[PDB]
Amino acid sequence: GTLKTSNLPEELRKVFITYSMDTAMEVVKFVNFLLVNGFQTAIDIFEDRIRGIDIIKWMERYLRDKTVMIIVAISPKYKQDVEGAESQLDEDEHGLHTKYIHRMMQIEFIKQGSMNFRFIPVLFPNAKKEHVPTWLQNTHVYSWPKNKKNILLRLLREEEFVAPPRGPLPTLQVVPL
Amino acid sequence: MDRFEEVYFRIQDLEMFQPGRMHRVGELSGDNYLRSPGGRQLRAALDRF
């Protein structure tokens, strides 16, 4: 085979992750994987120093940016958070922030004509396709760590299979009868 | 690949036969398909499957 250099501008290497507490353990490993592979991942645990100044501003910074790719870490608790987080017996602040992020994602999705340009649902080990929010089911759903190569390709914004340029037409022959 | 030449004519929207004459595509003929580069790849994949 042959090797191709990755020419993605650095600003496009930015990535933001939204998740729930049940996934936090696996999400740490996922961020390790992304950072090792050159992607600048923005997740609250590593950003707590800057995120603590103003949580809502920190979230809005990544939600505004169109060039930032958002990864949705699906899990059984994620659906509960994005649907009825406030209905819980106690107030889960992270659950509420996840719900707010989900609402902002949905609003942006609708504004764009229901075109999902930058939301990448990822099913984490203890997740099932039913837990994916309905509107996200309309795009590719990756399963971690099974499809991590495809996740990297999606983040790099490259197609796994690339067609060659349209080839020449064949020879046309005439035979008398 | 047993009638692919007809398939390519359907794609091109051309009749294969006409009064007193016949139309053919040399490369896409069965044997020529086998001899073609991409044809060999398709043949290998089909044999594998």
Partner: peptide
């Protein structure tokens, strides 16, 4: 006489 081929999708 062979007709002219054209690219197709």
């Amino acid at each position: 006489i062979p007709p002219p081929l054209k690219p197709r999708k």
